[PDB]
Protein backbone atom coordinates (compact mmCIF):
# COMPACT_ATOMS: atom_id res chain seq x y z
CA UNK A 1 0.00 0.00 0.00
CA UNK A 2 1.04 3.75 -0.43
CA UNK A 3 0.62 4.52 3.13
CA UNK A 4 2.01 1.96 6.36
CA UNK A 5 0.05 -1.25 7.25
CA UNK A 6 -1.46 -0.86 10.92
CA UNK A 7 -1.17 -4.05 12.52
CA UNK A 8 -4.52 -4.69 13.95
CA UNK A 9 -5.84 -5.50 10.61
CA UNK A 10 -4.10 -8.83 10.69
CA UNK A 11 -3.38 -9.40 14.79
CA UNK A 12 -5.76 -12.09 15.81
CA UNK A 13 -5.74 -14.32 18.91
CA UNK A 14 -7.36 -17.84 17.87
CA UNK A 15 -4.69 -19.94 17.17
CA UNK A 16 -3.14 -20.03 20.42
CA UNK A 17 -6.51 -20.99 22.10
CA UNK A 18 -6.97 -24.06 19.39
CA UNK A 19 -3.68 -25.08 20.23
CA UNK A 20 -4.19 -24.84 23.60
CA UNK A 21 -8.09 -27.08 23.64
CA UNK A 22 -6.94 -29.64 20.96
CA UNK A 23 -3.67 -30.51 22.93
CA UNK A 24 -5.03 -30.40 26.20
CA UNK A 25 -8.41 -32.70 25.01
CA UNK A 26 -6.79 -34.82 22.43
CA UNK A 27 -3.53 -35.86 24.89
CA UNK A 28 -1.22 -36.02 22.04
CA UNK A 29 1.20 -33.55 20.50
CA UNK A 30 3.78 -32.54 17.59
CA UNK A 31 6.53 -30.96 19.33
CA UNK A 32 8.38 -30.86 15.94
CA UNK A 33 11.23 -29.13 16.74
CA UNK A 34 12.00 -30.55 19.40
CA UNK A 35 11.10 -33.86 17.20
CA UNK A 36 8.83 -35.74 19.99
CA UNK A 37 5.02 -36.23 19.09
CA UNK A 38 4.34 -38.09 21.90
CA UNK A 39 0.73 -39.33 22.30
CA UNK A 40 -1.68 -40.73 25.67
CA UNK A 41 -0.73 -38.29 27.88
CA UNK A 42 -4.11 -37.47 29.66
CA UNK A 43 -7.01 -39.28 30.89
CA UNK A 44 -10.55 -38.60 31.96
CA UNK A 45 -10.48 -38.95 35.30
CA UNK A 46 -12.98 -41.90 37.09
CA UNK A 47 -15.61 -41.01 39.04
CA UNK A 48 -16.63 -44.89 40.57
CA UNK A 49 -16.24 -44.05 44.50
CA UNK B 1 -41.74 -59.38 1.02
CA UNK B 2 -43.33 -56.04 0.04
CA UNK B 3 -46.18 -58.28 0.22
CA UNK B 4 -47.18 -60.03 3.65
CA UNK B 5 -47.23 -63.96 2.64
CA UNK B 6 -49.59 -62.83 -0.39
CA UNK B 7 -51.89 -59.40 0.85
CA UNK B 8 -51.95 -56.43 0.73
CA UNK B 9 -48.68 -55.14 2.43
CA UNK B 10 -46.49 -52.58 0.94
CA UNK B 11 -44.71 -50.91 3.37
CA UNK B 12 -41.39 -51.39 5.76
CA UNK B 13 -40.50 -50.41 8.99
CA UNK B 14 -37.55 -52.23 11.50
CA UNK B 15 -38.31 -53.92 14.69
CA UNK B 16 -37.07 -57.10 16.70
CA UNK B 17 -36.58 -58.35 19.76
CA UNK B 18 -33.28 -58.82 20.74
CA UNK B 19 -30.25 -56.94 18.87
CA UNK B 20 -31.63 -57.74 14.93
CA UNK B 21 -33.22 -55.89 12.31
CA UNK B 22 -36.30 -57.32 10.64
CA UNK B 23 -38.50 -55.31 8.57
CA UNK B 24 -41.82 -54.25 10.23
CA UNK B 25 -44.97 -54.32 7.71
CA UNK B 26 -48.35 -52.98 8.13
CA UNK B 27 -51.16 -54.69 6.27
CA UNK B 28 -50.38 -57.67 8.85
CA UNK B 29 -49.15 -55.83 12.12
CA UNK B 30 -46.17 -58.05 10.67
CA UNK B 31 -42.42 -57.79 9.23
CA UNK B 32 -43.10 -58.65 5.67
CA UNK B 33 -42.75 -62.16 7.00
CA UNK B 34 -39.04 -61.56 5.62
CA UNK B 35 -36.98 -59.25 7.37
CA UNK B 36 -33.34 -58.35 6.24
CA UNK B 37 -30.04 -58.28 8.58
CA UNK B 38 -28.97 -54.63 8.18
CA UNK B 39 -24.83 -53.79 7.20
CA UNK B 40 -22.73 -51.12 8.95
CA UNK B 41 -19.85 -49.75 9.55
CA UNK B 42 -16.77 -49.00 11.80
CA UNK B 43 -13.75 -49.93 14.19
CA UNK B 44 -11.69 -48.28 11.63
CA UNK B 45 -9.06 -44.76 11.38
CA UNK B 46 -18.05 -32.73 3.90
CA UNK B 47 -16.70 -32.70 0.36
CA UNK B 48 -13.54 -32.22 -1.61
CA UNK B 49 -13.63 -30.98 -4.86
CA UNK B 50 -12.14 -27.81 -4.01
CA UNK B 51 -12.20 -25.89 -6.85
CA UNK B 52 -8.92 -24.39 -7.38
CA UNK B 53 -10.97 -20.11 -7.78
CA UNK B 54 -9.02 -17.39 -9.04
CA UNK B 55 -5.91 -16.17 -7.13
CA UNK B 56 -7.35 -12.70 -6.62
CA UNK B 57 -11.01 -14.34 -5.45
CA UNK B 58 -9.54 -16.56 -2.49
CA UNK B 59 -7.00 -13.42 -1.46
CA UNK B 60 -10.80 -11.90 -1.06
CA UNK B 61 -11.54 -15.11 0.54
CA UNK B 62 -8.43 -15.00 3.09
CA UNK B 63 -9.64 -11.20 3.94
CA UNK B 64 -12.81 -12.53 4.40
CA UNK B 65 -11.90 -15.10 7.12
CA UNK B 66 -9.30 -12.74 8.75
CA UNK B 67 -11.38 -9.87 9.02
CA UNK B 68 -14.48 -11.55 11.26
CA UNK B 69 -12.00 -13.50 13.88
CA UNK B 70 -11.42 -10.13 15.04
CA UNK B 71 -14.60 -10.72 16.66
CA UNK B 72 -13.54 -14.38 17.91
CA UNK B 73 -17.16 -15.15 17.18
CA UNK B 74 -18.82 -18.68 15.99
CA UNK B 75 -17.10 -20.10 13.14
CA UNK B 76 -20.61 -20.29 11.85
CA UNK B 77 -20.61 -16.57 11.04
CA UNK B 78 -17.13 -17.33 9.00
CA UNK B 79 -18.38 -20.06 6.93
CA UNK B 80 -22.08 -18.72 6.34
CA UNK B 81 -20.36 -15.32 5.15
CA UNK B 82 -17.44 -16.51 3.00
CA UNK B 83 -20.29 -18.53 1.43
CA UNK B 84 -22.34 -15.07 0.71
CA UNK B 85 -18.87 -13.84 -0.54
CA UNK B 86 -18.78 -17.08 -3.19
CA UNK B 87 -22.68 -15.87 -4.22
CA UNK B 88 -21.48 -12.52 -4.45
CA UNK B 89 -18.84 -13.52 -6.47
CA UNK B 90 -20.46 -14.56 -9.93
CA UNK B 91 -21.27 -11.03 -12.02
CA UNK B 92 -19.49 -9.02 -13.93
CA UNK B 93 -19.51 -5.52 -12.11
CA UNK B 94 -18.43 -7.24 -8.95
CA UNK B 95 -15.22 -8.83 -10.90
CA UNK B 96 -14.82 -5.56 -12.84
CA UNK B 97 -15.33 -3.11 -9.73
CA UNK B 98 -12.00 -2.14 -8.57
CA UNK B 99 -10.37 -4.07 -5.22
CA UNK B 100 -11.23 -1.07 -2.88
CA UNK B 101 -15.28 -2.15 -3.63
CA UNK B 102 -13.86 -5.80 -2.80
CA UNK B 103 -12.73 -4.93 0.62
CA UNK B 104 -15.84 -3.02 1.77
CA UNK B 105 -17.71 -5.98 0.19
CA UNK B 106 -16.07 -8.27 2.70
CA UNK B 107 -17.12 -5.99 6.11
CA UNK B 108 -20.75 -6.32 4.74
CA UNK B 109 -21.08 -9.23 4.39
CA UNK B 110 -20.26 -10.31 7.71
CA UNK B 111 -22.59 -6.87 8.83
CA UNK B 112 -25.63 -8.15 7.18
CA UNK B 113 -24.25 -12.10 8.33
CA UNK B 114 -24.14 -10.77 12.40
CA UNK B 115 -27.48 -8.61 11.53
CA UNK B 116 -29.13 -12.44 10.78
CA UNK B 117 -28.07 -13.39 13.87
CA UNK B 118 -28.79 -10.05 15.34
CA UNK B 119 -25.58 -9.79 16.51
CA UNK B 120 -24.51 -6.39 18.10
CA UNK B 121 -22.05 -4.49 16.08
CA UNK B 122 -22.08 -0.89 14.29
CA UNK B 123 -20.74 0.31 11.10
CA UNK B 124 -17.99 2.33 13.06
CA UNK B 125 -16.43 -0.63 14.66
CA UNK B 126 -16.18 -2.52 11.22
CA UNK B 127 -14.93 0.50 9.05
CA UNK B 128 -11.98 0.94 10.97
CA UNK B 129 -10.58 -1.72 9.70
CA UNK B 130 -10.98 -1.39 6.04
CA UNK B 131 -9.88 2.06 5.25
CA UNK B 132 -13.32 2.49 4.10
CA UNK B 133 -15.03 5.81 4.04
CA UNK B 134 -18.61 6.30 4.55
CA UNK B 135 -20.05 6.88 0.99
CA UNK B 136 -17.78 4.50 -0.56
CA UNK B 137 -19.27 1.34 1.77
CA UNK B 138 -22.86 2.66 2.41
CA UNK B 139 -23.26 3.01 -1.15
CA UNK B 140 -21.91 -0.32 -1.57
CA UNK B 141 -24.10 -2.11 0.67
CA UNK B 142 -26.99 -0.22 -0.68
CA UNK B 143 -25.82 -1.78 -4.01
CA UNK B 144 -25.34 -5.09 -3.18
CA UNK B 145 -28.60 -5.65 -0.79
CA UNK B 146 -31.42 -4.62 -3.40
CA UNK B 147 -28.86 -6.81 -6.06
CA UNK B 148 -29.73 -9.71 -4.35
CA UNK B 149 -33.05 -8.69 -2.68
CA UNK B 150 -32.25 -10.20 0.31
CA UNK B 151 -33.96 -9.40 3.89
CA UNK B 152 -32.31 -8.56 6.72
CA UNK B 153 -33.03 -7.36 10.57
CA UNK B 154 -32.77 -3.72 11.54
CA UNK B 155 -30.91 -2.80 14.45
CA UNK B 156 -33.04 -3.38 17.74
CA UNK B 157 -32.83 -0.23 20.25
CA UNK B 158 -32.55 -2.72 22.70
CA UNK B 159 -30.00 -4.71 20.91
CA UNK B 160 -26.62 -2.30 20.89
CA UNK B 161 -27.21 -1.06 24.73
CA UNK B 162 -26.45 -4.62 26.66
CA UNK B 163 -22.94 -4.62 25.10
CA UNK B 164 -22.56 -0.88 24.75
CA UNK B 165 -23.20 -0.32 28.76
CA UNK B 166 -21.25 -3.17 29.60
CA UNK B 167 -18.08 -1.21 28.07
CA UNK B 168 -18.08 1.38 30.00
CA UNK B 169 -15.43 1.72 33.25
CA UNK B 170 -18.04 3.25 35.73
CA UNK B 171 -18.18 -0.63 37.68
CA UNK B 172 -14.84 -0.44 39.28
CA UNK B 173 -12.81 1.79 41.10
CA UNK B 174 -9.78 3.69 39.37
CA UNK B 175 -7.70 6.60 39.83
CA UNK B 176 -9.54 8.15 36.48
CA UNK B 177 -12.88 7.09 38.45
CA UNK B 178 -12.67 7.62 42.33
CA UNK B 179 -15.74 5.79 44.09
CA UNK B 180 -18.16 8.52 43.86
CA UNK B 181 -17.52 7.91 39.75
CA UNK B 182 -18.29 4.39 40.25
CA UNK B 183 -21.34 2.97 40.05
CA UNK B 184 -23.61 -0.39 39.66
CA UNK B 185 -24.63 -1.29 36.08
CA UNK B 186 -27.79 -2.89 36.92
CA UNK B 187 -29.13 0.39 38.11
CA UNK B 188 -27.95 2.62 34.81
CA UNK B 189 -29.10 0.68 32.89
CA UNK B 190 -32.31 0.14 34.37
CA UNK B 191 -32.31 3.96 34.23
CA UNK B 192 -31.24 3.64 30.39
CA UNK B 193 -33.76 1.20 29.29
CA UNK B 194 -36.33 3.69 30.74
CA UNK B 195 -35.04 6.15 29.47
CA UNK B 196 -34.99 4.52 26.07
CA UNK B 197 -38.66 3.34 26.29
CA UNK B 198 -39.63 7.34 26.51
CA UNK B 199 -37.53 8.18 23.31
CA UNK B 200 -39.13 5.99 20.78
CA UNK B 201 -42.79 6.73 21.48
CA UNK B 202 -41.70 10.19 21.64
CA UNK B 203 -40.64 10.14 18.25
CA UNK B 204 -37.33 10.93 19.28
CA UNK B 205 -35.46 7.92 17.65
CA UNK B 206 -36.78 7.78 14.48
CA UNK B 207 -34.47 8.98 11.62
CA UNK B 208 -32.02 10.14 14.11
CA UNK B 209 -28.98 8.30 15.04
CA UNK B 210 -29.50 6.38 17.67
CA UNK B 211 -26.05 6.29 19.54
CA UNK B 212 -26.72 9.97 20.42
CA UNK B 213 -29.72 8.81 22.32
CA UNK B 214 -28.18 6.10 24.18
CA UNK B 215 -25.12 8.47 24.85
CA UNK B 216 -27.18 11.08 26.49
CA UNK B 217 -29.27 8.63 28.59
CA UNK B 218 -26.14 6.99 29.94
CA UNK B 219 -24.91 10.71 31.20
CA UNK B 220 -28.23 11.50 32.99
CA UNK B 221 -28.86 8.25 34.29
CA UNK B 222 -25.12 7.94 35.56
CA UNK B 223 -25.49 11.85 37.13
CA UNK B 224 -28.73 11.36 38.46
CA UNK B 225 -27.56 8.04 40.38
CA UNK B 226 -25.55 10.37 42.73
CA UNK B 227 -26.24 13.71 41.55
CA UNK B 228 -24.46 15.56 44.52
CA UNK B 229 -21.01 14.17 43.31
CA UNK B 230 -21.92 13.95 39.74
CA UNK B 231 -24.08 17.55 38.59
CA UNK B 232 -20.80 19.18 38.35
CA UNK B 233 -19.64 17.30 35.38
CA UNK B 234 -20.03 17.64 32.35
CA UNK B 235 -20.70 15.37 28.85
CA UNK B 236 -16.87 15.04 27.83
CA UNK B 237 -15.44 15.58 31.10
CA UNK B 238 -17.46 11.65 31.86
CA UNK B 239 -16.74 10.16 28.78
CA UNK B 240 -12.82 10.97 28.67
CA UNK B 241 -12.71 8.88 32.20
CA UNK B 242 -14.08 6.03 31.13
CA UNK B 243 -12.58 6.30 27.74
CA UNK B 244 -15.42 7.04 25.51
CA UNK B 245 -15.70 9.97 22.39
CA UNK B 246 -19.56 11.23 22.65
CA UNK B 247 -21.39 12.46 19.71
CA UNK B 248 -22.42 16.55 18.92
CA UNK B 249 -25.61 15.28 18.91
CA UNK B 250 -25.75 13.84 22.04
CA UNK B 251 -26.09 17.72 23.35
CA UNK B 252 -29.46 17.76 21.23
CA UNK B 253 -30.92 14.99 22.31
CA UNK B 254 -29.90 16.08 26.24
CA UNK B 255 -31.84 19.23 25.64
CA UNK B 256 -34.87 17.36 23.56
CA UNK B 257 -34.92 15.27 27.08
CA UNK B 258 -34.64 18.35 29.28
CA UNK B 259 -37.46 19.86 27.39
CA UNK B 260 -39.61 16.52 27.84
CA UNK B 261 -38.97 16.16 31.63
CA UNK B 262 -39.93 19.63 32.18
CA UNK B 263 -42.48 19.16 30.80
CA UNK B 264 -43.49 16.07 32.32
CA UNK B 265 -42.66 17.35 35.74
CA UNK B 266 -45.66 20.18 35.89
CA UNK B 267 -48.23 17.28 35.78
CA UNK B 268 -47.52 16.71 39.15
CA UNK B 269 -48.36 19.11 42.16
CA UNK B 270 -45.66 17.87 44.54
CA UNK B 271 -43.17 17.80 41.79
CA UNK B 272 -44.99 21.01 40.49
CA UNK B 273 -43.95 22.87 43.69
CA UNK B 274 -40.41 22.23 43.34
CA UNK B 275 -40.40 25.07 40.34
CA UNK B 276 -37.96 22.36 38.15
CA UNK B 277 -35.52 23.70 36.31
CA UNK B 278 -32.67 21.97 34.08
CA UNK B 279 -30.57 22.59 37.42
CA UNK B 280 -32.69 20.50 39.56
CA UNK B 281 -35.01 18.34 37.29
CA UNK B 282 -32.03 15.64 37.00
CA UNK B 283 -31.98 14.34 40.71
CA UNK B 284 -36.03 13.74 40.18
CA UNK B 285 -36.32 11.61 37.17
CA UNK B 286 -35.95 8.93 40.41
CA UNK B 287 -39.39 10.06 41.36
CA UNK B 288 -41.09 10.91 37.72
CA UNK B 289 -40.29 7.18 36.51
CA UNK B 290 -42.73 6.04 39.08
CA UNK B 291 -45.32 7.65 37.46
CA UNK B 292 -44.39 7.47 34.17
CA UNK B 293 -47.44 6.35 32.07
CA UNK B 294 -49.20 8.74 34.04
CA UNK B 295 -47.42 12.26 33.34
CA UNK B 296 -47.80 11.22 29.47
CA UNK B 297 -51.88 10.87 29.48
CA UNK B 298 -51.61 14.35 31.58
CA UNK B 299 -49.32 16.31 28.83
CA UNK B 300 -50.07 14.96 25.98
CA UNK B 301 -52.73 17.50 24.22
CA UNK B 302 -53.56 14.67 21.47
CA UNK B 303 -55.95 12.71 24.17
CA UNK B 304 -57.54 11.31 20.98
CA UNK B 305 -57.95 7.41 20.70
CA UNK B 306 -55.87 7.60 17.56
CA UNK B 307 -51.16 20.59 26.96
CA UNK B 308 -48.45 19.65 24.71
CA UNK B 309 -47.97 17.93 21.23
CA UNK B 310 -46.75 14.17 21.51
CA UNK B 311 -45.65 14.46 17.76
CA UNK B 312 -42.24 13.85 16.08
CA UNK B 313 -40.15 17.56 16.60
CA UNK B 314 -39.79 18.17 12.62
CA UNK B 315 -43.54 18.82 13.03
CA UNK B 316 -43.71 20.36 16.65
CA UNK B 317 -41.87 23.49 14.88
CA UNK B 318 -45.48 24.08 13.47
CA UNK B 319 -45.96 24.68 9.66
CA UNK B 320 -45.55 27.98 8.53
CA UNK B 321 -49.20 27.26 6.57
CA UNK B 322 -50.68 23.78 7.14
CA UNK B 323 -49.93 22.59 3.40
CA UNK B 324 -52.72 24.28 1.97
CA UNK B 325 -53.57 22.37 -1.37
CA UNK B 326 -51.40 22.39 -4.22
CA UNK B 327 -51.02 24.86 -7.19
CA UNK B 328 -51.66 21.49 -9.55
CA UNK B 329 -51.24 23.26 -12.97
CA UNK B 330 -50.42 23.49 -16.90
CA UNK B 331 -49.63 26.09 -19.44
CA UNK B 332 -49.15 26.52 -22.90
CA UNK B 333 -45.58 25.60 -23.38
CA UNK B 334 -46.65 25.75 -27.43
CA UNK B 335 -45.95 29.69 -27.69
CA UNK B 336 -43.84 31.92 -29.90
CA UNK B 337 -40.69 32.49 -28.14
CA UNK B 338 -39.32 36.18 -28.00
CA UNK B 339 -36.18 36.73 -29.51
CA UNK B 340 -34.93 39.18 -27.18
CA UNK B 341 -34.58 36.83 -24.36
CA UNK B 342 -32.64 34.88 -27.04
CA UNK B 343 -30.55 37.12 -27.74
CA UNK B 344 -29.38 38.55 -24.10
CA UNK B 345 -27.72 34.83 -23.42
CA UNK B 346 -25.01 35.73 -26.11
CA UNK B 347 -22.09 37.78 -26.03
CA UNK B 348 -21.51 40.64 -28.03
CA UNK B 349 -18.38 40.58 -30.25
CA UNK B 350 -16.93 42.86 -27.98
CA UNK B 351 -17.60 40.89 -25.62
CA UNK B 352 -16.12 37.84 -27.74
CA UNK B 353 -12.41 39.42 -27.93
CA UNK B 354 -12.92 40.50 -24.35
CA UNK B 355 -13.35 36.45 -23.59
CA UNK B 356 -10.53 35.85 -25.71
CA UNK B 357 -8.44 38.16 -24.31
CA UNK B 358 -9.10 37.30 -20.74
CA UNK B 359 -8.26 33.60 -21.80
CA UNK C 1 1.40 -19.10 35.04
CA UNK C 2 3.44 -16.95 37.87
CA UNK C 3 7.25 -16.96 36.77
CA UNK C 4 7.54 -19.43 34.11
CA UNK C 5 5.22 -17.89 31.42
CA UNK C 6 7.28 -14.88 32.18
CA UNK C 7 10.45 -16.30 31.63
CA UNK C 8 9.05 -17.92 27.99
CA UNK C 9 7.55 -14.21 26.94
CA UNK C 10 11.31 -12.60 27.85
CA UNK C 11 13.13 -15.18 26.21
CA UNK C 12 11.51 -13.61 23.13
CA UNK C 13 10.24 -10.22 23.10
CA UNK C 14 11.25 -8.33 20.26
CA UNK C 15 9.85 -8.82 16.68
CA UNK C 16 11.50 -6.52 13.22
CA UNK C 17 10.55 -5.56 10.04
CA UNK C 18 11.63 -6.96 6.80
CA UNK C 19 12.16 -3.03 5.27
CA UNK C 20 11.95 0.11 7.09
CA UNK C 21 14.84 -0.48 9.82
CA UNK C 22 14.41 0.56 12.95
CA UNK C 23 10.58 -0.87 12.54
CA UNK C 24 9.95 -3.30 15.41
CA UNK C 25 7.17 -4.36 17.41
CA UNK C 26 7.78 -5.10 21.30
CA UNK C 27 6.31 -6.75 24.09
CA UNK C 28 6.69 -5.75 27.57
CA UNK C 29 4.25 -7.40 30.03
CA UNK C 30 1.51 -10.23 29.95
CA UNK C 31 -0.74 -10.94 31.77
CA UNK C 32 -3.96 -13.88 32.29
CA UNK C 33 -6.18 -12.41 34.28
CA UNK C 34 -8.87 -14.91 35.73
CA UNK C 35 -11.20 -16.96 33.95
CA UNK C 36 -14.54 -15.77 32.83
CA UNK C 37 -17.64 -16.90 30.07
CA UNK C 38 -17.30 -15.36 26.85
CA UNK C 39 -21.19 -14.06 25.88
CA UNK C 40 -22.76 -13.54 22.13
CA UNK C 41 -22.75 -10.50 22.60
CA UNK C 42 -19.05 -9.22 23.01
CA UNK C 43 -19.68 -9.45 26.76
CA UNK C 44 -18.84 -11.53 29.78
CA UNK C 45 -19.33 -12.38 33.56
CA UNK C 46 -17.09 -14.54 35.98
CA UNK C 47 -18.58 -18.68 36.53
CA UNK C 48 -18.13 -21.14 38.79
CA UNK C 49 -16.14 -23.97 37.60
CA UNK D 1 -60.19 10.07 -2.70
CA UNK D 2 -57.22 11.11 -1.08
CA UNK D 3 -57.35 13.39 1.99
CA UNK D 4 -57.59 16.45 -0.05
CA UNK D 5 -54.06 16.64 -1.49
CA UNK D 6 -52.53 15.54 -4.87
CA UNK D 7 -49.05 15.42 -4.82
CA UNK D 8 -46.84 18.77 -6.27
CA UNK D 9 -44.44 18.37 -8.70
CA UNK D 10 -40.76 19.31 -7.97
CA UNK D 11 -38.87 18.42 -11.10
CA UNK D 12 -39.16 17.67 -14.79
CA UNK D 13 -36.18 16.20 -17.29
CA UNK D 14 -36.54 15.85 -20.81
CA UNK D 15 -34.07 14.92 -23.63
CA UNK D 16 -34.33 16.67 -27.44
CA UNK D 17 -31.80 16.23 -30.28
CA UNK D 18 -30.85 19.29 -32.02
CA UNK D 19 -30.42 17.39 -35.19
CA UNK D 20 -26.98 18.61 -36.38
CA UNK D 21 -22.86 18.55 -35.04
CA UNK D 22 -22.16 21.29 -32.75
CA UNK D 23 -18.38 22.84 -32.04
CA UNK D 24 -19.04 22.98 -28.20
CA UNK D 25 -15.67 25.75 -27.89
CA UNK D 26 -18.04 28.05 -30.44
CA UNK D 27 -20.78 27.74 -28.39
CA UNK D 28 -18.97 27.99 -24.52
CA UNK D 29 -17.05 31.18 -26.19
CA UNK D 30 -20.25 32.78 -27.72
CA UNK D 31 -22.61 31.95 -25.07
CA UNK D 32 -23.20 34.69 -21.91
CA UNK D 33 -25.65 31.75 -20.64
CA UNK D 34 -23.38 28.51 -21.45
CA UNK D 35 -20.48 27.02 -19.61
CA UNK D 36 -18.04 24.30 -21.16
CA UNK D 37 -14.56 22.66 -19.76
CA UNK D 38 -13.46 21.10 -23.31
CA UNK D 39 -10.66 19.59 -21.59
CA UNK D 40 -13.11 17.23 -19.47
CA UNK D 41 -15.95 17.21 -20.47
CA UNK D 42 -18.29 16.51 -23.83
CA UNK D 43 -21.07 18.88 -23.45
CA UNK D 44 -22.01 22.62 -22.61
CA UNK D 45 -24.74 23.39 -19.95
CA UNK D 46 -26.48 26.54 -20.08
CA UNK D 47 -29.10 28.18 -18.20
CA UNK D 48 -31.79 30.30 -18.52
CA UNK D 49 -34.42 32.35 -16.09
CA UNK D 50 -37.75 32.12 -17.54
CA UNK D 51 -38.61 28.58 -17.83
CA UNK D 52 -36.06 28.73 -15.16
CA UNK D 53 -34.26 25.64 -16.29
CA UNK D 54 -30.94 24.24 -17.80
CA UNK D 55 -29.70 21.90 -20.68
CA UNK D 56 -26.71 20.25 -21.39
CA UNK D 57 -25.83 20.17 -25.02
CA UNK D 58 -23.23 17.28 -26.15
CA UNK D 59 -21.32 17.45 -29.25
CA UNK D 60 -22.92 14.64 -30.81
CA UNK D 61 -26.14 16.79 -30.91
CA UNK D 62 -27.68 15.33 -27.72
CA UNK D 63 -29.64 17.18 -25.33
CA UNK D 64 -30.76 16.91 -21.82
CA UNK D 65 -32.67 19.72 -19.87
CA UNK D 66 -33.90 19.86 -16.31
CA UNK D 67 -35.69 22.20 -13.93
CA UNK D 68 -38.79 23.01 -14.97
CA UNK D 69 -41.74 22.06 -13.40
CA UNK D 70 -44.32 20.91 -15.69
CA UNK D 71 -43.85 18.91 -19.38
CA UNK D 72 -44.61 22.38 -21.16
CA UNK D 73 -42.21 24.05 -19.29
CA UNK D 74 -39.66 21.74 -20.00
CA UNK D 75 -40.62 21.75 -23.80
CA UNK D 76 -40.67 25.66 -23.38
CA UNK D 77 -37.54 25.59 -22.48
CA UNK D 78 -36.13 22.86 -24.34
CA UNK D 79 -37.34 24.85 -27.43
CA UNK D 80 -35.42 28.22 -26.45
CA UNK D 81 -32.11 26.27 -26.04
CA UNK D 82 -32.84 25.36 -29.68
CA UNK D 83 -33.60 28.96 -30.45
CA UNK D 84 -30.16 29.52 -28.85
CA UNK D 85 -28.40 27.35 -30.70
CA UNK D 86 -30.16 28.32 -33.69
CA UNK D 87 -28.70 32.45 -33.00
CA UNK D 88 -25.18 30.73 -32.75
CA UNK D 89 -25.06 29.78 -36.39
CA UNK D 90 -25.50 26.12 -36.24
CA UNK D 91 -28.64 24.67 -38.10
CA UNK D 92 -30.31 23.55 -35.12
CA UNK D 93 -33.83 21.98 -34.88
CA UNK D 94 -36.31 20.76 -32.47
CA UNK D 95 -36.78 16.81 -33.26
CA UNK D 96 -38.01 14.06 -31.23
CA UNK D 97 -38.62 15.82 -27.62
CA UNK D 98 -39.15 13.44 -24.99
CA UNK D 99 -39.75 13.88 -21.36
CA UNK D 100 -37.82 11.34 -19.23
CA UNK D 101 -38.00 12.16 -15.65
CA UNK D 102 -40.37 13.84 -13.28
CA UNK D 103 -40.43 14.43 -9.42
CA UNK D 104 -42.91 14.84 -7.09
CA UNK D 105 -44.57 15.08 -3.59
CA UNK D 106 -47.18 15.78 -0.94
CA UNK D 107 -47.97 15.72 2.68
CA UNK D 108 -50.79 13.82 4.58
CA UNK D 109 -51.09 16.24 7.87
CA UNK D 110 -50.18 13.09 10.05
CA UNK D 111 -47.16 11.46 11.42
CA UNK D 112 -45.81 8.18 10.12
CA UNK D 113 -43.73 5.37 12.32
CA UNK D 114 -41.87 4.49 9.06
CA UNK D 115 -40.68 1.02 11.56
CA UNK D 116 -44.30 -0.50 10.88
CA UNK D 117 -43.61 0.43 7.04
CA UNK D 118 -40.37 -1.46 6.87
CA UNK D 119 -41.67 -4.06 9.23
CA UNK D 120 -44.79 -5.00 6.70
CA UNK D 121 -43.61 -3.86 3.34
CA UNK D 122 -39.99 -5.60 3.54
CA UNK D 123 -40.01 -6.69 0.10
CA UNK D 124 -40.36 -2.99 -0.88
CA UNK D 125 -38.83 -0.94 2.23
CA UNK D 126 -35.37 0.25 2.78
CA UNK D 127 -35.15 1.94 6.35
CA UNK D 128 -31.61 2.86 7.39
CA UNK D 129 -31.69 6.20 9.82
CA UNK D 130 -27.91 5.83 10.09
CA UNK D 131 -27.28 6.36 6.52
CA UNK D 132 -30.48 8.23 5.35
CA UNK D 133 -33.26 9.08 7.91
CA UNK D 134 -35.98 8.99 5.16
CA UNK D 135 -37.84 5.29 4.37
CA UNK D 136 -37.35 4.58 0.75
CA UNK D 137 -40.30 2.75 -0.81
CA UNK D 138 -39.78 0.45 -3.89
CA UNK D 139 -43.38 0.99 -5.70
CA UNK D 140 -44.34 -1.88 -8.69
CA UNK D 141 -46.99 -0.21 -10.09
CA UNK D 142 -46.85 2.57 -11.56
CA UNK D 143 -42.69 2.18 -11.99
CA UNK D 144 -42.13 4.56 -8.81
CA UNK D 145 -39.98 5.29 -5.72
CA UNK D 146 -41.34 6.95 -2.67
CA UNK D 147 -39.47 8.36 -0.32
CA UNK D 148 -41.13 8.68 3.09
CA UNK D 149 -40.96 10.82 6.35
CA UNK D 150 -41.70 10.68 9.30
CA UNK D 151 -43.31 14.18 9.35
CA UNK D 152 -45.81 12.64 6.82
CA UNK D 153 -44.23 13.96 3.78
CA UNK D 154 -43.98 12.13 0.99
CA UNK D 155 -41.56 12.26 -2.73
CA UNK D 156 -42.37 10.30 -5.50
CA UNK D 157 -39.72 10.01 -8.67
CA UNK D 158 -39.56 7.98 -11.49
CA UNK D 159 -42.82 9.01 -13.52
CA UNK D 160 -42.84 9.46 -16.94
CA UNK D 161 -46.05 11.10 -17.03
CA UNK D 162 -48.05 12.72 -14.35
CA UNK D 163 -50.83 10.38 -14.11
CA UNK D 164 -48.18 7.77 -13.03
CA UNK D 165 -46.77 10.46 -10.09
CA UNK D 166 -50.79 10.22 -8.96
CA UNK D 167 -51.33 6.70 -9.40
CA UNK D 168 -48.43 6.32 -6.98
CA UNK D 169 -49.66 8.73 -4.82
CA UNK D 170 -53.27 7.08 -4.78
CA UNK D 171 -51.97 3.29 -4.28
CA UNK D 172 -49.89 4.40 -1.50
CA UNK D 173 -52.58 6.21 0.36
CA UNK D 174 -54.12 3.36 1.91
CA UNK D 175 -51.49 1.97 2.90
CA UNK D 176 -49.90 5.01 4.77
CA UNK D 177 -53.72 5.26 5.67
CA UNK D 178 -53.48 2.01 8.02
ZN1 LIG E 1 -54.38 -59.16 4.57
Same mark, same amino acid.
Given at each position: ?49 | ? !? ?10 ? @? ?19 ? !? ?95 ? &? ?24 ? &? ?19 ? &? ?170 ? @? ?8 | ?49 | ?178
Amino acid at each position: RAAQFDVVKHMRQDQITNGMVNAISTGNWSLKRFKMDRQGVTQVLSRLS | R !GRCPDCGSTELV @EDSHYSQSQLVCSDCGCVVTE !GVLTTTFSDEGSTGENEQVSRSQQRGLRRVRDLCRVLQLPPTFEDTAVAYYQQAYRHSGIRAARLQKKEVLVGCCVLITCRQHNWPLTMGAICTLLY &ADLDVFSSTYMQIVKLLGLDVPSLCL &AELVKTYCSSFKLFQASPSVP &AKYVEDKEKMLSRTMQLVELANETWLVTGRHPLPVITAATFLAWQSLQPADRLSCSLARFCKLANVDLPYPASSRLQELLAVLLRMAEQLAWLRVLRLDKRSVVKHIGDLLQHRQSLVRSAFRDGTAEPALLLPPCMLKSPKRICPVPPVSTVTGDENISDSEIEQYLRTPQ @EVRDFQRAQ | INVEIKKIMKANEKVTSDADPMWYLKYLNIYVGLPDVEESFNVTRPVSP | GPSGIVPQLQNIVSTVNLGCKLDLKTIALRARNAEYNPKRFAAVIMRIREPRTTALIFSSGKMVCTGAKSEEQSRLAARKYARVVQKLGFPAKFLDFKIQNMVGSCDVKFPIRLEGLVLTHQQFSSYEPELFPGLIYRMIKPRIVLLIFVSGKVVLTGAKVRAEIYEAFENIYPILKG
